[PDB]
Structures are given as structure tokens and as C-alpha cells.
Amino acid sequence: SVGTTFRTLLKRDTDWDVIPTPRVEPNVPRIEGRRWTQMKKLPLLKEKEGPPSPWRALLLGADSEYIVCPPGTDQEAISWIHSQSEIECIRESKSTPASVITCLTSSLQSFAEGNPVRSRIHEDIIAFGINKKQEKKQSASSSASGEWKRAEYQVEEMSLPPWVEEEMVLLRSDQEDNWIELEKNAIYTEVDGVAEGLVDKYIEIVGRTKVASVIEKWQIAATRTFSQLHTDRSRITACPIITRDPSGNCQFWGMVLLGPHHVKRDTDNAPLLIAEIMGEDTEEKYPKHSVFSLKVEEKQFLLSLKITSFSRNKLYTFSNIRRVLIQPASIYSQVVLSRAAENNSLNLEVNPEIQLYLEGAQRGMTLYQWVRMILCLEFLMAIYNNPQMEGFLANMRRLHMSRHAMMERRQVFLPFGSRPEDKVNECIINNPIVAYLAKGWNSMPNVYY
């Protein structure tokens, strides 16, 4: 049942009554439409011009090394590093003042003295942005002038950096250690043996690479930082990034310092001061990093200090960075099982020549190297995930499908106002790896016969 004035309430914002009874005869009209078009040209992605985009990631990535320390606990290694080293600044950045080395050394000494959390010092004021919100707000209020206008935000376009290729080729380097220690599951059936053999082969072909060590460093650093964010503190906490090689020695990748971090919301930022052992300094790649000289046991090391704030969600996500291994493992497993379904023979050592487009040429290369480079590129994409990358990949799936269709001798048709490249291009602004993927797509031929 329905009321009386309730019907008026319903009808006051529509022409028809509660139960429409149109008086027009039901018919579908004939409307003139445009003509579907066809394309010979694969879309050519525009390359944004401007300054090369710097390295914007939580950790260093390729330029990541460690100090070999005598075997012992984390405290022993930190004490050894603090008591056997002197620091002198090489490169100073206005983003990260050189005075934060005092905070880093104080944290090292406190951790060596069995105190992972230490009281605040004066140098911590400009190290974690303490009272920076109030400072900026009061300065803006004092210097405010003019009249209000719309926010009209803007994102600066940046070009493809030259170091992305250097990053890709450096993460390929062989390593002495396996860097991937995953405990094996049980085996009861022969299919379980097949799965475990596939996983072991994948681990042994990607484990001894620099990207695996960088993934381990990222996982450890993010896990240690995340394990301390839950406790609401007001004092600086130190989370060393230390691994062990298969001889007992301690490998010091760096230290991350966590500020007061009075965090309330799950997406709120947390102040961080990340110290890292760098291999080669670069001004245009690390403009916001402060690089210090490090002298342990008459050896040369570069120490990089950066001021960053990083949300709890992102730290939790990067603590599970080991999941990046699945997709290259998927590709490797599919190739291997295809070359087992071809002739009912699981070899587990098949290394086919995968044909790819290299420097605008069609050449083949081994499966193992291809899986390694897939893993490196996937790691770079994962550590550089933002809305630009999401949109770029989502809108590139269609172009990838069209390219596959025209390689498989098929015709691709488009609607009237169909420009699939525009949606990819709108997502290419300043992401280095989005630009790298765009250039890789552009290097391939756009005509197929």
C-alpha cells in the first residue's frame, strides 16, 4: 500500500507518476551513425620532455651494497660499525641537511648500547619534520596576501632517465649467495615433486642475482620498520638492515630511523631517516640524498642519508615484497610445462631461445636471462607503483592485445572517435618506469606483414 502525500513526495521530482504509462508507441528509431575505421599503424606513444625524473623510491635499489661484519648479533655488528668508522660528508643536499648524521650516529651508539629506542636530540628537529606543520601554517598565515582562488594543482612532466637501463642491467649481475631462503614444503606424490623441482629450479636461476638481494633488503627493512609503527611512541627507534651470508658474517645494508610518528589513520605518514650503503653517487639520480664517506677497516664505502615519510600501508605492502617472484615464476613454469606437454617429457632444464625485439632488432636469447630481466622489471614496477603506473598498465593491456592480434594475422577495427593511445598517454607524466615501458613499446615495429 502507498500513502497520499507520499505519492506527491515521489512525483515532485519526475514528470511521470509512480507507475509510468507512456503514451508513445514502442518503436526503435533509425539513427544515422558513423563508419568504423581500421588502422595499419600501431599507436605511437608520446615521450614527455623535461628534466629526467630522479630516483623516487623508499630504498636505493641497484646502488645497494653491504658492509661485511664479523659474525654475531645485530647489536654486535652495530657496535662494530659505530666503533670502527668515521663519517665525513661528500655531497650535501638541501633536502637532507648534513646535520642528520648526528642523529644517525646517536642511533647507532644507542643501539650498540642495547637501546633500540633513544631520547630525542636537537638535530632530530630538522630530521623528522617535528612541528613542521605548525611552522608552515604560521609562516603562511604571516605571509598570506591576495585573494582566495581554486587549488588548481599541477604535476610536473619529466623525461625518461638514463639510469633506468643502468638499473635494469645492474640488477642482472650474478651473486655468490642464493639470497632466497624459502623453507621447502613436504612431498608425498610425484606431482608434488614436480612442483617442488620447478620451484627449486626457479629459485636457483633467479636467486643468485642482485635483484634477489635487493628484494631481501627491502623485505627486511620494511618488516623491521612496520613492526615498530604499531606502538605509538615519541622517541626515535632504530631498525638495522642486516643479513647473514652462509658463513656467519653480518651484511650491513643500512639503518632506518623512525621518528615520533604519532600516527592515527592507517594511511598517515610516518617520519623516517634512512641510511644506506651506496655504490656510486649521482647528482641527477639522487638530488635529495646526502652522501657521506665511510671508512671501515681501511675500506671505502658511501653512506646515503635521506629524509622521508612513509605510510603504514605502503610499509606493510613492501614487507611482503617477496610476492614479486610469482609472475616471473609463472612465465618460467608456463614455458617449461609447454615444453613438457609438447612431448610428454619434463626435462626441468629446458632453456629455449626466446625471441624478442632488442634495440629495434629481432633476436633470440636464453629463457633464464629472460626470466631474470622479467623479475628485475617487475621489481622496478612494484617499487614504483602509483596511479600513473596503474592506468598505464590497464590501458596498455588493450594495445598489447591488438599487437598480438596483428602478429597473429588479424585485422583490428576501431569506432569513430577511437584513439586508444590517448588513455595510455594521459598516464605518462613523470614515472621513470612508465617512460621506460613506453620507450620499449615504441622501439618495436608498428607495422606487421
Partner: protein
């Protein structure tokens, strides 16, 4: 990108899984949603006419539009009434068994659904507390309001709830128990009010989106129409719900014929639909099946209310003088949304024509499907919200072009407006994509939008292990993962599970077990994993005893029913433990007493619903029977 396109031994379709931003943080929406909500509201008014005339479009009410006025070169909101009627007629004539089962649903089990299922919904903006409350709390508060201001007890069926809403909406004055009063116009505006919020964890696009949730008063009507839409959608081959893509993949065509394959998306899918078209569709179906009139009102009220939506415009536009920033409501200062200033109603804003995400994701699909049903469209179509795939099976290339063009025009007839840039048509069939699945020749590839978490869920060791292994099993079953991926993922999950429960390295739990000579006998304790790829569907305790890795004495110790601490296929044990201005924390505790006395007296509620007529004090009838 050249590394993602193999040329030998493997095709780009399978490796397209690499074109996914897995393992990276999902984009997170920051700041005010006012600009996004205002843009969402203003898009449908900008597409009503071929020439953009926003101001003329703010007073259109019913969005019906004449032909030779639909924008064929761009987005076009609104619909054509005659086209909607004809397409609904065509859809009703076809799929007769689906209509018969819809009739069965609407006659038999429609006046049977319990109204308590509205508690398992989404966050609701209470019209009494002036804030957001969980769905069960909102339902309880709303039914208390109905009891207080209507004096007739609400029946178990949700038809009683709908009748109560309709009856209470005719009162000039209402007062809640505190003791706050509501005018009829105030309550009507609250019913019109839509709570909008950012859509979080949304991967796949550059720009963030906002979703809107309805008030609890209209949620019963929304749920009944959505349930009817779902019931009629499960029984139509053109729907996006089931193996439809695989079914169309397993199709053989003529030897020498043109077989197209159109895969595309919808642009401004929620910015070009009008609830009046849905009204016409539902009324046509109901009228041609033969339902009574009260069914007509019952199915038409939701879109009637939605035609007068009052979606909240967030917190306000952002204005900057110098380095300062301020949040200003619309209309305080000029901006690019000045045409909607006249429609500002307090903190909310009125928009007659348009849609929002999260309101009707099934009736929109129904409207698209009734658009599909025509005469010259002799093809196969699968529709799911804003994504679709179409198969063309004709004799001439120009025939295929005409079919595609008339498909686009008919979609525009009700205002679907598929994106020209997102639609790709292949002259020979074999390659396409729909939802996240990918099609290549006779193989269809399911690629997940999200990887499995590969971390413990966070309740207890046994439950977390069971859920993790079940998630991995589901992922491998759907074809998204294989032997190597499954084993690697379960190894990663094992490592994370052991770390999260103090089973790795030196920690308090490990030291406690070591100093007291407690041998770790389970995975969460630190023992070697017992689960394999084949045995990941088995319980840990059940599997260990068969292999002799868990002594029967240990089973007796842990499986003791008299234990201090006590789909999920895990047996209870000592490891099944639960981790430790509102003015509402007291009434959840007193409701706990009500839930505590039950499930101790009634084994029946642990089987079925609480179908006991009356039973206010009447619970004493059972206790006396227990004594007797």
C-alpha cells in the same frame, strides 16, 4: 615493454599477466571528495544535448529525449522512451524461462525474505546520530524509530519493513527515543541523502572515484529490486554471471565467414544512466508478466526515491590564497561548478538525472541487456556492469560493421555510451578480453586483479593457515596459478605465517619453548611444514597424526574440550584463541547478554533462522518445557 612480447614458444596473451602492478601499494585517495562528487554530478548534465548547455539541463526532471538528439560522436545521457519500451518488450519475449522463474521468485519467495539480512550490508549514515554507523546498528536504530513513531510491531518479513517505511513517511512529525524530533520534510531529505565516500584500494585507473551508499530506509527497496535483478540475471545467457566466455570460446563457425570479436568498456557508465529508464524496464516486465499493482509500486519506489538523490558533496572545495589552503563549500566563491549552486541544499546537493557507483550494478546490466535484444543483432553478447564482449557471426564485412554500429547506437539509445578508445574489434574471432579474463583461440586465461595476500589472516594460527591454504587452492583452481606458482606461494605464506607467530629466529615464544623442553610439533610452533601442493586441502592436525608427526598423547593434550581458550575446516584446539562520546558501547554489551542466553538454550538457531512467532518473556515457555 619489448621484454613483455615474446615471439617464440609462447604468445603475448599468456604473458599479458606481467602487465599487472602486483605487489605494489594500491593507490589511496587523499583529501576532499567534493571536486570528484561535483564532477560526477555535472557530467550527465553536460552530455544531455549535442551542444553542451548545462544550465538548460538542470531542469529536465524525466530524462527522456527525442531521437536526432542523441550524441553519436560522444557521450550522451538520457534515454528514448519508445526505444526503451520496444527493447524491454523484445527482451521480455525472449528468455521466457527466465521470466517464469522471476515470476516464481516474485510470487512465492518475495514475501519470505527476513528483513534482518540488511545488517550484512555496508557503512550507513545514520539520520539520528548524524554520523556513520555499522549496518546492524543502523538497522536496529531504524526499527526502534519505526516502533516508536508508528506503534505497530514490525513483522519478520521485509515487506512489513517496507510497509512501515511507507506508513511512517506520511506522518507530519516524528520523534525518536535523546528525544530528538524530525519533521516530515527533514526525514524525506534524509531519505534522499546519499552518503558519498572515496573508493579505496581501486587499481586499474589514474583517477580516484567516489561511491555512494543509500540510507537504511530505502535500503529494503534497493535490496528487493537488486535481488529481483540478480535472480533474472542468473538465468539469461547474455549476463556476466554464471563460464560464459569459455562457452562462447568453445564455438565452431562456418569455414569461410566473417567472425568478429568486439571487446570494450563503458565510459561514464554511472554518468549517463537515468533511473526512469530502469523504471520503464521494470514496469514493462511486470506489466507483461501479469503482477498486481502493489508489486508495481513496490518495484518502482526505489528509482522514484533515487530520482531525487541528495548526494553529499564531501567537505568542500579547496581554495588557496597564498601558501594557505582552506575548504570552502560550493557557492561561497566562484568556481567551475557554478551551475550547480542553485541545487545546493545545505551540505548536500540535488541532481535529478545521473547515477552513482555502488547503487544498482545489476539493473544497469539488465538495461544494457534489453538494449542488446534486437532483430539485426544476430550475435553473441556478454555484459557485466561497464565491461562487455561481443561476438559477431555474419557473412559480410559490411554486415559486421552495420551490426557493430547499430549495437553502439542501441547502447546509446538508453545512454550506455561505450568508450570508443576502449573498444577493440577483431575481424576474425579468437582474441578478446572480458572482465580480467583473456581469450586466445580455444584457450581462455583467467588473470587475477589481486594476488593472494600470502599472509596469515590474523585470527589464530589454525584458522589463518586454513584460510591461506584455501585461498591458494582457490587461486590455483581458477587457472590463475599452477604447480610452480602454487608451491612458491605456499612457501612464501609458510614463511610469513611462521614469522607472524614468533616461530622464526630467537623470540619470546621460541625461548619459552626451548627453556621448558617444549618440542615444536606444529607449523606455527616452528616445525617443518607438513602441507604439500597436493595436501593443501587437508587439516594440519589431521594430516600430522597419519604421518606420525603428532603423538596421540599430544592430540589428547591439545584437543581437550575442557581447554582454557576456545570455509574454516580446522578442528578446535588450544591454538584456537581470540586476540584481545560513543555512548553506544553499553548497549552492545547488553545485547551480548541477549545473544549469550541464546545459543546456550537453542540448538535450533545454530541450524536455521529464529522463526518463532511472537516470543517477546515468552522464552520461559521453553525453560518450563526443559524442566518438564
Amino acid at each position: 615493454m619489448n621484454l613483455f612480447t615474446p615471439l617464440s614458444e609462447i604468445n603475448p596473451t599468456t604473458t599479458q599477466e606481467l602487465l599487472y602492478a602486483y605487489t605494489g601499494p594500491a593507490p589511496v585517495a587523499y583529501g576532499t571528495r567534493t571536486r570528484a562528487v561535483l564532477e560526477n554530478i555535472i557530467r550527465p548534465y553536460q552530455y544531455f544535448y549535442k551542444e553542451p548547455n548545462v544550465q538548460r539541463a538542470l531542469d529536465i526532471k524525466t530524462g527522456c529525449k527525442e531521437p536526432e538528439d542523441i550524441n553519436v560522436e560522444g557521450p550522451s545521457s538520457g534515454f528514448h522512451t519508445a526505444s526503451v519500451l520496444k527493447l524491454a518488450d523484445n527482451f521480455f519475449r525472449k528468455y521466457r524461462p527466465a521470466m517464469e522463474k522471476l515470476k516464481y521468485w516474485i510470487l512465492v519467495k518475495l514475501p519470505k525474505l527476513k528483513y534482518a539480512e540488511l545488517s550484512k550490508g555496508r557503512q550507513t549514515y545514520s539520520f539520528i546520530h548524524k554520523r556513520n554507523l555499522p549496518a546492524p546498528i543502523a538497522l536496529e536504530e531504524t526499527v526502534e524509530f519505526l516502533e516508536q513513531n508508528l506503534r505497530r510491531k514490525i513483522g519478520p518479513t521485509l515487506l512489513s519493513y517496507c510497509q512501515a517505511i511507507a506508513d511512517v513517511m506520511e506522518l507530519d512529525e516524528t520523534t525518536y527515543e535523546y528525544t530528538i524530533k524530525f519533521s516530515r520534510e527533514e526525514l524525506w531529505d534524509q531519505m534522499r541523502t546519499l552518503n558519498t565516500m572515496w573508493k579505496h584500494l581501486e587499481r586499474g585507473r589514474l583517477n580516484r572515484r567516489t561511491i555512494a551508499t543509500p540510507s537504511m530506509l530505502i535500503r529494503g527497496f534497493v535490496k528487493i529490486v537488486e535481488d529481483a535483478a540478480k535472480e533474472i540475471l542468473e538465468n539469461v545467457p547474455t549476463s556476466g554471471v554464471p563460464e560464459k566466455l569459455a562457452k562462447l570460446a568453445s564455438k565452431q563457425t562456418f569455414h569461410t565467414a566473417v567472425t568478429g570479436e568486439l571487446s570494450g568498456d563503458q565510459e561514464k557508465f554511472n554518468e549517463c544512466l537515468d533511473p526512469d529508464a530502469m523504471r520503464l524496464m521494470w514496469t514493462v516486465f511486470l506489466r507483461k508478466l501479469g503482477c498486481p499493482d502493489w508489486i508495481m509500486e513496490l518495484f518502482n519506489i526505489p528509482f522514484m526515491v533515487f530520482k531525487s538523490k541528495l548526494a553529499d558533496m564531501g567537505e568542500g572545495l579547496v581554495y588557496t590564497k597564498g601558501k594557505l589552503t582552506d575548504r570552502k563549500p560550493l557557492g561561497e566563491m566562484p568556481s567551475e561548478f557554478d551551475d550547480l549552486v542553485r541545487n545546493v541544499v545545505g551540505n548536500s546537493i540535488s541532481c535529478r538525472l545521473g547515477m552513482f557507483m555502488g547503487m544498482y550494478n545489476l539493473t544497469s546490466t539488465l538495461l544494457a541487456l534489453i538494449s542488446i535484444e534486437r532483430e539485426e543483432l544476430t550475435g553473441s553478447h556478454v555484459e557485466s556492469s561497464d565491461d562487455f564482449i561481443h561476438f559477431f557471426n555474419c557473412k559480410t564485412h559490411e554486415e559486421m560493421f552495420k551490426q557493430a554500429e547499430t549495437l553502439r547506437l542501441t547502447l546509446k539509445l538508453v545512454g550506455i555510451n561505450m568508450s570508443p578508445s576502449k573498444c577493440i574489434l577483431i575481424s576474425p574471432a579468437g582474441i578478446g578480453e572480458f572482465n580480467s579474463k583473456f581469450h586466445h583461440r580455444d584457450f581462455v586465461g583467467n588473470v587475477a586483479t589481486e594476488l593472494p595476500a600470502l599472509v596469515p589472516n590474523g585470527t589464530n594460527p589454525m584458522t589463518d593457515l586454513a584460510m591461506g591454504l584455501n585461498v591458494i587452492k582457490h587461486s590455483v583452481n581458477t587457472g590463475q596459478m599452477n604447480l610452480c606458482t602454487g608451491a612458491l606461494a605456499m612457501r612464501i605464506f609458510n614463511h610469513a605465517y611462521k614469522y607472524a607467530y614468533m616461530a622464526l629466529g630467537v623470540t619470546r615464544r621460541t625461548r619459552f619453548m626451548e627453556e621448558n623442553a617444549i618440542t615444536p610439533l606444529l607449523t606455527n610452533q616452528g616445525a617443518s611444514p607438513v602441507h604439500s601442493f597436493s595436501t593443501m586441502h587437508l587439516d594440519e592436525v589431521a594430516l600430522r597424526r597419519h604421518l606420525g608427526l603428532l603423538d596421540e598423547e599430544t592430540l589428547r593434550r591439545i584437543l581437550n574440550p575442557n581447554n582454557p581458550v576456545t570455509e574454516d575446516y580446522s578442528v578446535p584446539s588450544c591454538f584456537k584463541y581470540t586476540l584481545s562520546h560513543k555512548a553506544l558501547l553499553n548497549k552492545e554489551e547488553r545485547y551480548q547478554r541477549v545473544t549469550s542466553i541464546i545459543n546456550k538454550l537453542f540448538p535450533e538457531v545454530l541450524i536455521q533462522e529464529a522463526s518463532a512467532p511472537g516470543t517477546v518473556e515468552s522464552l520461559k515457555r521453553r525453560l518450563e518445557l526443559v524442566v518438564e
